[model samples]
Target: RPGEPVVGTGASLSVELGPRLLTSIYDGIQRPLEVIREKTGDFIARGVTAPALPRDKKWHFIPKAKVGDKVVGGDIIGEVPETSIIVHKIMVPPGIEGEIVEIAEEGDYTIEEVIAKVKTPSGEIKELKMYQRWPVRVKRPYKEKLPPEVPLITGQRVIDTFFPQAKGGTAAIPGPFGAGKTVTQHQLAKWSDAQVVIYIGCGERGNEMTDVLEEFPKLKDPKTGKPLMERTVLIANTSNMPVAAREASIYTGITIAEYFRDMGYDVALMADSTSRWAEALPAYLASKLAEFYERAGRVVTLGSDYRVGSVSVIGAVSPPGGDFSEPVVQNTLRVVKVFWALDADLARRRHFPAINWLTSYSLYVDAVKDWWHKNIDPEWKAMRDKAMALLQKESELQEIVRIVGPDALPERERAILLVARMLREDYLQQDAFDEVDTYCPPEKQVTMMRVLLNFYDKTMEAINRGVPLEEIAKLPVREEIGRMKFERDVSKIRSLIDKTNEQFEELFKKYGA
Candidate 1:
């Protein structure tokens, strides 16, 4: 009975399972449901447990530390070619401080084999295997935590320039049903530049989770051109699963993400429908969300070497009936720095991302502003601010238009309304189904804002010089501005900006104002 294989145990998953990440479809407790489904039929048998990783597959393990080298816990001893994209670094399991007495040579070895022997402080010989088990709820040790300064670069125009989520930052997407919350999460999972993606479909519909399982394998990573699954790990604990498992799903998801982060890789995690999992938080639920978000950070891992990694968490909250006043939404909003409030109104108007720019904001904007200034553009922050002001002005002007109408407003005010319309329709709106517009890089986003802002500036100048609003409206560049979002080539986008600028110059000269 002492050596018997146990079932229904309370122990956590193995650190060995970390190497088997990316390309895995796991349930809340780290069971590969797909593998379980294969063992049984499409429906799973109750209390079924399967190995998380393929035991028989051999990985080419190359030793990094030599024999007699003194090593501490979290020190890298060897490396394995886990996948084409991920090179799994085998660390001395945490709490196993020792000097390597003997080490395995460079050879193919299964995960179960003893690859090294270490002499511990207590004079006991510790067998270093490729796998180590860790409790899911415990936070991994890290040496130092850095500030959230680098942008995550999700490739969504609205998000990147406006409500940017810094690497290792915490954010929440709170929206109602039919508000494209899942689609936004899917977009971030597909397009965010993080090296590893952990998507936890916590308490969503089974079919919804199935979409991730079905689509990730077929989709290609734009950065590597490899299958997206090669860089993704999915944990599907849907609404039909046990409520306890649903509550545990985020713990499992963040722990797995932290494993990759400790490897000095940038990881992004998506926790969808946290409201369904919030039943555990109870009367003290407000603080539970804080603890969950606090787990995400850019940290120096527990090692003597100078290594860094980050875990950025983007949690999606399904507020009942699109109400931000709901407890889950309010609690999440308190901790998460970035709030991307999806709007039913914008979604109904067929906006793809539907983020209400007016309501939504990023606290990390100041923290990450310098990053944009150095990497993308010097005027990035200023441009974003100005564009937002114009959008805000439109809302106020529309109130006036509703009563007195556009005809009663001044020529300059009407021009502001016109540019604001251009900002909304031509700049802010993006088509997810379209090829060119789906993923907007930071460079493209900056260029697009430049054109819009430049037009707004020139329109104000043109109106001041006694030019009629009708003449400015009739220019062909207005139509060209609307179509510039589909332009993929950066050179062509620049040329369009140039041509639009020239059109304004021609108008100024013709009127000689």
Candidate 2:
């Protein structure tokens, strides 16, 4: 199976970090390598190997395989548990083909235990050839004029329509307990347009993180039909794993993502709850040395820690009691581009994708507008700006209403509050099950916002005309919005809002506004 000039010198090649390594496969040449041996067997269960966290009681499994079973390269062997209902299955692939001669099954196995090995096939084994390494060594110019233009659509209505991300841009989702951070990250992994997705479930409850570990492989890519897991690599160091291991999990995940990106793949690396790792670092270092140098009561360092690369990190940080100013959250904010906050109260109220837009911030919004303008309607910028402004006003009014009650507010102020409430309940609360239902083309996002805004205007007018809240909430606005389903036509959104003035007048008259 050796391609051109057969390699005879080295029998087994050690893959190196920098200039010495070589990939046999050409760029963009995706091919299936058949499994000649099965690498499966020895499993290190949770309680027996790694100590389980207080919340996690289940056993985590790692595999031990015997020789000769044809394991298709990249087959799953075991997985860690998650907090959610889903299970995370770990991959155990035979790196090379041959008979499995060595099997280590009897000893005490740790989380990092190696369970098996495989010999290379007789004809397939070849010395790694370095023909032209210069092209691969050319570093991407980070200082060059790389404009962060074009939006990377995340299929979620609120994100795609409101705060869009760009390819290679970093973002963070910070939420309190039970605020759907895992689910939100899963949505991004499935929907983001990036070529590769590296998901790191670090120091979170095993079961919750496992849901993503399991579900992502089952979700088929619409275009390829093959499992989306092919493009995904999971680094799951759960809370039960050694705290020392947890500290390295995020970096491990990023390194792999960066490896793929260096191969020119548009990679999206996501870490669920990075704060735990931030906490783990200090603990890990302190455990090693008795006398610790302290900076502001905590050990701190400078730019030497970061390795320059195209690996973009999007993470979730669970703040203690929903406070964003927490040290962990603040540390993460300094490294990421977008910050998405999830309101626990909203989540408890059954708001599916419960993002607190008032608190979340996407720094790359301006950079991604050109993609929006080209694929989505050109007026999306203005519409989003207006909608966000309204949300700000709503937040301000809610503070006043909490003090003086809704009934004490002036008619105009009360009406605005009502409109804001309607927007939150109807537009923001999306079903995660239905997240992939309508893939809004970038253009449709703008059109949909316009339609929602127009509907808000008419509903407010009806309220001003003395219409009851119940009737206003139940008006055919749902059906009108339903007609604007993006997944179906991908263009119906424009139709639903293009003639908004006429439609609003009719709705107003019907409601006696």
Candidate 3:
């Protein structure tokens, strides 16, 4: 009995346990031990313990956990079914060495459930805490009054080289229904360098929003192979939600974004179809008015109900009939920093993500140009200015051509239109796929523009030699002429620009452009 395994407590066994115990004998040993380690960080938000995906069988509606509750490790938060009698339980762990501020109640819960919050004891001595710097407590202040600084370099040639968005600013892309606002917003969210992205799909169709919600997470970061979902948050208040709730959705998105910004992240908040939110506001106010009239015998006068916050709000507003002065557009113009008016006509013409550059304006562009000019190539400014001037002239000439046939215009004027056509086709109409492609950097924008402009110069010289528009439009002759003159010019210019950019990169390595 002394050397055998212990049985019922009536028998006493005394055996010498050696340092190197057998595997079977060592497994039998049980001892109470306390591991001492100082607390490192507090878990302010312990998210709900539930699967992100939905269950197959029975419908479950679990009540959410709240402040002031206790949960041990492996305690069930809720349950779901797979098949048969096999049950799946959602549980919490006892690793939380602190008081629980929130916990799940007895009920049902589906996927993506938010569970609870917990506050842990700060291990620092009370006296020393005041003297030490705490990273968690330090909040980043929003740049509310100061003008937006740095250019938001959208990779699209039309947007980047021509109409640039200032960093930490806002830009709305408003169009009528079915005019690619969602696609444009998707492009911005994917490419924009804002540290935090808040995408609010307000009153948009369920399928479109779902498409975005589904696809966005799978999108890979261009710089890092990791999924882009980490830096982005989605707020979806679809067309089905209550109209009153729709009004609050944009603000809700901003609130989250502002919270992230306070943590020192540059955030970009985008609301699709904010027009619906504006419409909901008036409807809600009208309903309130009806109640006021019935109770007090007079309707109360309306004051400012729209509360402006720190988040940079960019939204797409569907104009009721493509009128710029529509109530929704006018209302949105008051709060937004940039207005990127998209034309439905242009979109229908297969101008993918059609943005009207003439109407759209960024008020912060001038304010941010000091940093932009210093970091970016100097020729970018000159090329943009010249190209814009040409665009204006071409627009005027196109109007004239519409009134009077192209044949009636003078040779010089007609030639300008021809050159403008080349510019638009070659530069403005970039492939949407290329826009998202990180293969081309911002520096290549200037390089490509110079190439196209140099080509235009050669085309002008050929036109002066009496080359007909019809003749020039033909691919063979155009290619031949470009090869003889334009190609050579572009080769020289591109080489120079590349060398300059390389030198600039070395000089500004610390600034990261």
Candidate 4:
């Protein structure tokens, strides 16, 4: 084994930290499955595995370096038109810093051909290919890491509103079995706003990968309006294939994420259910739980999972029955800035997301709220606090309301229950599958929040003044308010508000003392 003094050049058992549009499945080594499918018509690809870049296709290289020019590791020696999204920066390979001795002419050439040659720190000569191989367990360098101030806008209201994550921030989602972990990851995969998405399916179910390989091709990115896969790199080794014991699989996915991030794209990597990544049999649970979690984290450190200009990593850990004291949950919880706790109890009762807002916590909201306040509204924190308070109030009142009938409570108590129910049913729990509801804009989220709170205010006022509870609950205006999240046109919000105003006017006219 070569120590720090010796470095291997342009030769590897494998890759990019550059810009080319990548839309293919990769084995852990960044080998493209698309080309192999065309040649072999089988999932199995052996040997040195085909080049990640197109071999037959020509790339127009423009020379930025020639004979006798000094170059450092990341110095852009040339550029190639890689994709509409970004240019392929042909960089001086890491190590071997010296003067260029020979270089290729600027024109069309395949990625396999050497574009330039550099004399090494040692007297030996080295050739620089179109790409360089990096150990999956290393972070690609960045100039500096700024505070991750920008929010990664996931369309889910619960996430965007509450446990918001910064663009380069880190988050962990730990839930119980059957508690929406797989579905949650898929929803984020389909809708999270990022330039590139690398989904690492280490030890999850076989069907999960099958679902992604199926849906992503057909699903279009809402922002770019392109097939989602066009900007996606899926590194999946689920069930029997390679499995989690093949630990490199997770790092392979992260290195791919870092490559896109180095190209100045906001990349997101999801390691779905590491509890699955660490899954063994049912009986030998606790010890199996503890060690492999740190194994999951080793991928993050080496892979540069968080960098201000780079990546955001969202991983899910499903401990049985939402158990947190288990060694696995404790280790992961100790490391993260936020942990979104999910409940199978809620899922068992048929609530999707099944995420217990009261129990789920995020330290990122402070770091993330700056973006929310700057672009959306300055009163964002107040709204978040009030809404969270509303949910907490509901949690408490529900326990009391469970024993006492709605008829026994005052109008204000009854209305508290109603507001919380609407928040959960209408605002928080969104149909991720619905066309319009899949993405709720920042303005819309704020507007809807205000509208529902206003509904609470007016309904409480009319109730105190003698308006009947049934009249308020049964009002047709409630239906319109329910539809705001489903409505895309911003214009419809005003109309919904006006309808509620008219219903309140009717209540005042009839009940005026």
Candidate 5:
């Protein structure tokens, strides 16, 4: 929907997406760089220069659709061979569906001149440009949004298997600084299973941008065996290049993503710790994420004197304007698999960490799983799996509970829900402030999981036997499980679970209620 019109400004600021799909390097609004920069003698960017698809230079504006062609928004009307690698896709802007009254044939013409004419729904003829003037802040309209079910298989194990984001879903990554935010996003841009990757790097140092602009073409996409730049798009506003245009593009990248999404392709966008300066700056920062990412690899043998240990590169970020298809988060998923995707809802409810488990994942589970299984119990995997299953189920029930209230489910099911909440607040959560329990042992990991799973099963069995869920809840040991994360020694942790286990069994022995 269109926003309400605002009071006037002194002068109109014009903007449009590029004529070429992904070829040129541009600032906030691409300018007459070639003629302005080159035609001016010394190239120091002197003053005003004649701009745009230069009139003197001829473009082979080849027509794809004929005159009288009935085309809607985004329908490809024609293409111009802008570069050997990039063919400029000329589309009709949205909401202007009509028949082409006239169009250019295979010939040369300047972009300043109208290339075609469209007779709109209102019976008014509108001139079509090689580029569409999509105001940078608005999202391009989509036909519809069906619920997103498939995961956006980011190949990063933590996210893909556990806290998986739907194939076309939106997510965010915010962490304390140096928690590997930047590096993680770079990894996503390189590896995620999307057809096209867009990275928007704002509020990051200048040269990360330089690293990308200089080195990206030299690298190759493993899938295509061609230069990686062929499938990538780069945009940035950095120190070297000052920007005065509208703050970058939440609308820009979404417009691009939606364009390709409707064009029948999967697209990914990454925004590197963007700012609220304009409240929407994720679209144009992808350039040099390429540069440093190309060189930052290891298991190295250089001077080899650079003493680096198991480094954890953490980064803190929140989206500029809350675009869920946000590039920073998508890019973060690309690089780091261990996200504690902190939740705003949880935060508002007075949890500072606001850590959201549904959006959180630990890619190290397999690595840790083998260790826990080897040491403690072979059943840990199933226990952990069941705990997560209960948690995910709770989110589903939360919707129903909000709709019909807790009494709607049979008491046993409601009992299950009650235990699920405890599992979330008790078993799954740990306070970093706790000196002892904060860094739990691997063996303790296996032990705590089984304890929760054990409580879940026995209580459910008791419920099935016509006992009220309250029978298990009345045990003296219930509160101990929630504080178990604060327990330091493994023996004490095991001691607690054993006592909690015994207390539950005694409940069943007495009343199953």
Candidate 6:
């Protein structure tokens, strides 16, 4: 048996699985949870295996190619009415090239049934099925890799407005326990604009996946009224699984993500924590980290029409004792362009996202700025930079204030400190639990940021005109500005600047300069 040919399927699934993916939960090896539950009840029996997609279910395949049509790898052969929202494009598998000898009529057929026959130039006839098999470790082929240019547009203000990741970029959220890393990942899975989401629970607790399973099915997608799970594929390889299988799940998740990407969809992949996977095999951490993150990219698919797609990889890393210098965190930092460093200090302060604004940085900032300017606002980048500068200045001032006290600073410095606090408490600190504040749109984010910065500018002008810093800080409009985060209307947020301007004028009038 050892010497015999293995007839390797290589952890693959049917191309017809497009319809089933969004609403399904799968194990690390692509076994459906429902199938497993039905077969062995709650506790899975040893050596029990189930198919990823339903084998007996028939899909209505619509043929795009006729007899005598020349086809190569990645050529669109037919399509299936996948879901109400998604159309399943069947394509020639990579490394397959031929002329269509015979094609099945448009009708309902099982994935196991051969839908077409291809004659290679070498005179061999190959049977084509609706299913495909790809080794979990292998990278799917693409026409060419492109630079990450467009922002993934996560509704989280701190990420979208400051440390943004490109659609094809890689990011890591590294933090200690109780720092909201898992919650942040769940938010991204729930709210990011990517057409498809792949959430890999690699080496985390089983309850983590259960949390997702419990909530995702009930939540409705913003884009479509359908359930959020309709666009999500979950791969659960928890700590209970073997180390090797745990590591393999990341590949399995990414490969499935790339499968959707090849269909020309913007896909987002969330690895809850890669630390568990690395802990399995310590020596091979860096190399494997590079290999995993390297698969994320904007790419031209290997098709005749050459559709463009992207896979955005956001991996979470758990550093022991909140020490970021740990092996898993460092290795992930080296490969990912964006670093959303979660801080326990912020977490202790009850910041829901807990992403450290001072430490976190995105290499894709410049890459995606053009998009923000063209689509959102022209002054978006400048306002973002100004807000960041204030937050930066606040850190330095905090050090001095600790030594000399806050009242010791000059008026300008005091104004800077006040504005920085406003930025932190009112603007940057988002409440994930609040329904309105949970997902702020980019338009609202820009307006809210601009209003905060406008207050800073007006405060500085008032200081130059000899108005007291305390008076400006104590202005009733400050309360209004503080409450701006919960305001859902963009016009209302923009109007806060007007309110601040009027209050500043009243202050100058009171001073009578």
Per-residue lDDT for 98-203 in model 3, tens only? 4455554554443334444455565321110001111112121222334456666666667666667765566667767676666676677667656556666543
Report the CA-based lDDT of candidate 3 relative to the real structure: 0.48
CA lDDT of 401 in candidate 2?
72
Predicted model with the maximum TM-score = 1
The lDDT for every candidate, in the order shown, is: 0.79, 0.51, 0.48, 0.68, 0.54, 0.79
For candidate 5, what is the lDDT? 0.54
- Residue pairs clashing, model 4: 15-132, 15-133
Q: Which lDDT tens digits does candidate 1 get at residues 1-513?
A: 012233544332333354666688777666776433211111221334667667787889899999889988778898998878878888887788888999999998887789999999898999987767665667777888899898999988888988999999998887676868766877888789788999886545656656665666798776687887888888876655665556566777888888888878999988776556635314455676678788999998877688999999988777555446666755677788998989889999887689898899999999999999998999999998999888889999888779876766899888998999998888778877789988888888888889888888888999999888899998898888888889999777777677878898899888876
Q: Which stretches of candidate 5 lie over 4 Å from their true place?
A: 1-14, 29-64, 79-88, 105-115, 121-123, 176-183, 239-246, 275-513
Model 1, stretches more than 4 Å misplaced?
1-16, 34-48, 209-214, 278-281, 320-325
For each candidate in turn, give its C-alpha RMSD to the true structure in angstroms.
4.5, 14.5, 20.1, 6.6, 17.2, 4.6
Error of 5 at 512 (Å): 34
Clashes of 5: 25
TM-scores of all models?
0.90, 0.61, 0.58, 0.79, 0.49, 0.89
Worst 10 residues of 1 by lDDT: 36-45
User: What's the lDDT for candidate 2?
Assistant: 0.51
When sorted by TM-score, best at the front, the candidate numbers are 1, 6, 4, 2, 3, 5
lDDT of 6 by residue, 114-152 (tens): 999999999899888876766556788999999878899
TM for candidate 1 is: 0.90
TM-score, cand. 2: 0.61
TM-score between model 4 and native: 0.79
lDDT of 1: 0.79
